Amino acid sequence: MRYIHSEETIPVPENLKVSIKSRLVTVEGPRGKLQKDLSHIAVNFSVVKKGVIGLEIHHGSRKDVAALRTVRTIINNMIIGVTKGFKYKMRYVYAHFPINVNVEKNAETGCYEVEIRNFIGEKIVRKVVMAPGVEVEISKAQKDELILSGNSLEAVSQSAADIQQICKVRNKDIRKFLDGIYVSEKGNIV
Amino acid sequence: PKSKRARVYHLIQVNKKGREAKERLFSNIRETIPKYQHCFVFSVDNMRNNYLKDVRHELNDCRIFFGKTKLMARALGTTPEEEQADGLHRLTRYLTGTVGLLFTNRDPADIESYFSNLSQVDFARAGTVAPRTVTVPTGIVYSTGGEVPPEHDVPVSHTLEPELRRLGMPVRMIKGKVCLGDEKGEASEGYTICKEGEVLDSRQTRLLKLFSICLSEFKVSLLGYWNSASGEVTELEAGKTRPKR
RNA sequence: AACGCGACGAUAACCCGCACGUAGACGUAUAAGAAUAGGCUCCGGCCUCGUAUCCUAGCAGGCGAUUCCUCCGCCGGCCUCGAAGUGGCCGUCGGUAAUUCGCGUAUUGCAAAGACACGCGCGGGAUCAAAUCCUUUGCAGACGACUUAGAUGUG
RNA sequence: GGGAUAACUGGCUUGUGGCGGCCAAGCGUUCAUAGCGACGUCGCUUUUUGGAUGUCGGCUCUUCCUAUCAUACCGAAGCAGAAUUCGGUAAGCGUUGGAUUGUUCACCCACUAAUAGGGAACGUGGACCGUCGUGAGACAGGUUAGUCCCUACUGAUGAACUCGUCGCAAUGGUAAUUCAGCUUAGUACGAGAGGAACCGCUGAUUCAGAUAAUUGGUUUUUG
RNA sequence: AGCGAAUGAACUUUAAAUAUGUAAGAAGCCCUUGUUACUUAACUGAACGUGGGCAUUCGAAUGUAUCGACACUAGUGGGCCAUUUUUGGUAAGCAGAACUGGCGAUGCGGGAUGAACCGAACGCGGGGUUAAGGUGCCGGAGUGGACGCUCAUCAGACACCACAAAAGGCGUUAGUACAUCUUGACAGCAGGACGGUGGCCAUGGAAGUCGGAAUCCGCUAAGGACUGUGUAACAACUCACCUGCCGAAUGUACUAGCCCUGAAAAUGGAUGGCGCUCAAGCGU
RNA sequence: CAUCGGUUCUGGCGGGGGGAUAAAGGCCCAGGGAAUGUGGCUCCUCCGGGAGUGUUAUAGCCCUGGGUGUAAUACCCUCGCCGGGACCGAGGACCGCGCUCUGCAAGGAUGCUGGCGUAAUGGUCACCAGCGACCCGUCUUGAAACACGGACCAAGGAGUCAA
C-alpha cells in the first residue's frame, strides 16, 4: 500500500547513554558495554523528547513497517541488559549416573568453559564454550543448578541452548531416559 | 491477504451473547428501579467475587446487580434529562470502576451494619502487597506447603509438579513423591514464594492458590445510596476518597 | 598450460661488405578510504552537477632586450617504492612572456631529388660461452627420450 | 483379384478399480435444476473362527540416474535394554548364490554390511512364381530376395623462443571402504530371560600406491 | 423490436448482418393485323412478316494494358498444408466432403535456426521513407518516459494447449458480500467459570471429561448435565461464556492479478548466448 | 566556392479560423457555504506544542451569477517567411507556357578559382578485415531425405540422312 509514514518509540532511562553513528547503536550503562549493527534495515533514527528515541520509515510497505517493530525490541533488550541484566538458571537432573559439571574461566580470550562428565555413564568429556560476555557459576542456593548471567540476551540464550543440545540422548527412548540439562528459570539479575 | 493466524472455532454449546444480552440487562434494571426503595452502590476493587453468590443467598429480600458499569450507567441514566427517577444521574457519576448496584427495601442502617460485619479470608489477587513471608520447607513438599503442621498434612499430588516447576519452583520427584531437595530432607535451602511488602505478581498468586494459602481479606466497600422518596444521594465514606467520574 | 609466470648462473665485444628507416598518440594531464535511511571539513562551513581542477600566448613557436626567481628537464647525493616494482628531497647545469617592447614570417599566389648524424638487420671470417651428435653408463628404455661419466682426477 | 495408410512415438510415462445410488460449491437455455458435477459414503467383486513366464544368452568392463538394499545422519512408534518398523536428507562407497528349471521370477535354504532397481537409436569387447492337386495339400520344383577411410583422446617424443639450474601453480583428475575384538561392562535398562552406547585401544576384508630384507616360485650366469 | 399491432425458429407491422442463385435495352419493348407444318375452346401460345417512340441523359455504380468467331500448333493432366463451414467417431487421437488461401515455376526483410508463421513480391545504380520485427551487449537502434505488480533451492522473457482439480499455499496486492464496534471491536493480561447435582442407567471403580440416553432449572455478568489435561475414583488445571485494564477499526467467506507446488529419470547444455531483480520480467 | 534547378531531411519565426467564440486564471462586483478551522478566546507536561469554540478578523478556501473580454494559452485545422545538410545535373541552335518584362529562378548547371606527368588514375596477383554464402548433375516424391554418377587433364562424343 506504500505507507507514507510509520514511527515507533524507544524510551531510555536516566542512567543510560545511547549513541547511533549510522546504524551502529551502542548502549552504555551501569552493567557495561553493548553494541550492534543494524545496517541491513532502512530506519531513520531521531530524538523527539528528552529520553525518547524515534525510529521512522518513510514510503514503506508492510514489511518495512514490520521491520521497525522487531528493531524496537532488540534495542530495548539492549537497554534492559545494560540496566538490569539477564539470568538463565539451568538445572541438570539424572537417574543413576551423577552428572558432573566444572566451570573454569580461561585466561586467554576470557571465555568461561563448561565441561560435563558422566552423562549416563559416557566416558567422553563434553566441553562447551560460552560466548564472550556471559558468566557461569554453580548455584549454591539450590542443588544441581547452573546460573548463566550476562548483558547480551542473545549471548546468554545461545550459551544456554548450546548446553542443552550437547547433552542430548541418542538412540534411546526419551520417555524412559530423562537425563539432561534443561533451562528452568529465565529472567533478570535484579 | 495471507500469513494470518487461524481462529480456533469452539465446538461448544455456549455462544456469544451480543446485543440481546445488552437490552435484557437494560430491561431488568429499568424494571427494578421503581420496585425498590433505596439504590445502594458498592465496590470490590481487586478481589475475587466468588463470594458474591453468598450475599445473594443471605440477602434474599434485596435485588443486586453487578455487570458492565457503562451499561448500568446508561440504564440509570447518565444525563439528568434521560433517567428513570430524580437523583439517578447522581449515581451514574458514582459508577467508575468495578462497581455494582444494590436495590433494597429495608432500613439503610442495617445494610452497612452487615457490610461492616462481613469478613471472609480470600486468596490474594495479583497486585496487592503481601502481609506475610510464606515459605515451603526445604524437604518434601506437601499440599499446604507447611502452613498446617506436616504431621497433619497430605503430600501434594504428582500431577502438580508440572505446574509447580512451570510456575518457578525447583522441585523434583523421587520414588513418586514430589520433593524440593532430598527426600529425607536438608540438601537444598527451600523456596520463599513471597516477601514482606512485595507486590504479588501473577505467578506467586497462582502458587498461593494451589497451596491453599489465603493472604487477603474479602470486604465489600459500600459507597452511597439514593432514596426514592428523598430523591438525593449521600456519600457514605468510601466515595470521599475513591476516584469518581 | 609443450603459444602461463618468476628467481638465478654463464653469453656474442670485433673487423670486411650492403638493405631499409602503430586493432590506431595529437594536453593521448588528474590515486584517499568509506557511507549511500548519509558524508566531507580550514571546525568558519560545505555536498544534485567532472558544466570540476591543473596546464595552455611566442618561426611546428625565431633573435635581441626591459624585466623576473616561477615552472620544466638532465645528472649526481641521500632515502624511499616488490601484487606484474618508483617517486621524494637536496645540490650542479641547461631551458623558462609573471610585465612591457624592436627586427624577421609574404609571390608555396582562396583547402587538396643535397650534405651530415643515429638505429634495426642481413652475408663472410675471427673471439667467447654453451648445447647436441660421439664414447661409456643402466637408477632408464617399443623406438625416440632419460640418469651418469669423459680436459690430470677423491679420474 | 481390385481399392486405402510408406510406418510408431516424440512435454509420451509412474500410487491409489469400475458400475449405480445419496450428498453437493459453482456455472448454466432465464435463475443451484435443460442440466454438468469433485471429495466422501452405501450396494457388487468381498468374508463371523488363521504359482506364473519364449528364443536368447553368459561373463567382464566403462559411464550415468535415483525411484536407497547396506553403510552416515536425523523425525515418529509401548521404542525399557537388545533387535527392529515407518518416514525424510542423501548415489560418497559397496551391492551373492544354491534348489529348481527351456529360461526366469515367486517361494524355500545358505553367506554377507547388504549382497536395490534401472538408462546408454534397449552401451564397448525367407519371396515370390510355376507345376500338380481342391472337402484337404504339397514339389530334389525353380530362380531370386539379402555392404575400410577420417578423427577425438592418452602415452612417449618433438621444431622455434640463447643454453642450463631452482621454482610458482591457472586448469584437469582426486580415495579410501566395511567389519570385528579389548575397555566402558555383565554396567545403565530389566520381573526374568537377557543386554547397549560415547571417549580411548588393537586388528581384519575390500580398494589404491609402493617395495624385495626375509619365505615360496622361476634359471640364455648354461654356475 | 413489439405483442400500450393481431395471432402464437414454427408469433408477426417491420427487419437484420453475412455469404449465396437470377435480370438491369436498340442484339429493346408493347400491343394491332394477317399465316403455319406445332398447340389451344380461342394471335390462347411459338415462328414469319407489320407500327411507334426516343440516337445532342439510349434507361444504376466502378473499372476497362481490347473483344468475339474460325482454323492450326507445343507442354500439362500430381498433390501437401492451413482457415472457415460441415458429416461421423474416440478415453484422446482421427477419418471424409465443399470453398478459399499458401507451396508447387519464387528471389528479399523478420521469427537465433527451419517446406507450411509474419511482412513484401524481383532489370542495373544513387538518395529518401516504411512494413514485419526490434532499440543492455553480441547487433544498426532507448540502460527512453508514465503508473503499478512480481523474488521463483535452475522465476520469466512478445505474440500457442495438456499435466491441472470444486487442488494444495501462516506468499503478496486489489476487490465484492455479510457481521462486530466508545452501547469500548478483535488480541492480550487480572480474575470469576457457580448451586440442585458425586444428575439417570452400566459398575472395584466412571463425580463434566472409558461408555448408552436425556441434556432441565435458580443466581445471574456468565457459566456446558461440558472443550481438553488429569485421577483407580477424587482433587486440581483448562476451554466455552462473563467482568475489570488498554484503546480504534476490525474478521469471515469468496473473486481477480503475479508468485511457489501441482511428478522426475538417466553423455555436459541451453529464453540463441551472455546475463538481467524500482529488470534487460509482466499489463497498459 | 557563389548563384540556380530536382528530390529529401531537419530547425526557427510571422499571421488566420475553430471549438463552452476553449476550459482555466489575474483584478474587481454581488450572494451563499464549509473545514484538513485563520486570527481571537478557554483548557493548555511553555525555545515550543495539542484539544475545543467560532465563519475572516492580523491567513485563506469552495460554489454560483456578472464585468474586464471578441483576454491570453493549450489542442486541431490552415496562409505563408527564413536558415542548416545530403544526393543528383538527364537534354543540347530558336520555337512552348509564363513572369516581378532594357531580362527572369520561365520546356533538365552555369560562373569563378585551383590542382594534375620521377605519376593523376587504373589493372592483376597474394593476404588481412566486416558482412554474406550447403556440392554439382540425374531420379523419386507434395516435398525434403534416400539412390545413381563425379580422382584429375587433353582429344573424341549423342535428334542425322533418304522415301
From TrEMBL, chain A:
<dbReference type="Pfam" id="PF00347">
    <property type="entry name" value="Ribosomal_L6"/>
</dbReference>
<protein>
    <submittedName>
        <fullName>60S ribosomal protein l9-like protein</fullName>
    </submittedName>
</protein>
<comment type="similarity">
    <text>Belongs to the universal ribosomal protein uL6 family.</text>
</comment>
<feature type="domain" description="Large ribosomal subunit protein uL6 alpha-beta">
    <location>
        <begin position="16"/>
        <end position="85"/>
    </location>
</feature>
<dbReference type="GO" id="GO:0003735">
    <property type="term" value="F:structural constituent of ribosome"/>
</dbReference>
<dbReference type="GO" id="GO:0019843">
    <property type="term" value="F:rRNA binding"/>
</dbReference>
<dbReference type="InterPro" id="IPR000702">
    <property type="entry name" value="Ribosomal_uL6-like"/>
</dbReference>
<feature type="domain" description="Large ribosomal subunit protein uL6 alpha-beta">
    <location>
        <begin position="97"/>
        <end position="180"/>
    </location>
</feature>
<dbReference type="InterPro" id="IPR036789">
    <property type="entry name" value="Ribosomal_uL6-like_a/b-dom_sf"/>
</dbReference>
<dbReference type="InterPro" id="IPR020040">
    <property type="entry name" value="Ribosomal_uL6_a/b-dom"/>
</dbReference>
<keyword id="KW-0689">Ribosomal protein</keyword>
<keyword id="KW-0687">Ribonucleoprotein</keyword>
<dbReference type="InterPro" id="IPR002359">
    <property type="entry name" value="Ribosomal_uL6_CS2"/>
</dbReference>
<dbReference type="GO" id="GO:0002181">
    <property type="term" value="P:cytoplasmic translation"/>
</dbReference>
<dbReference type="GO" id="GO:0022625">
    <property type="term" value="C:cytosolic large ribosomal subunit"/>
</dbReference>
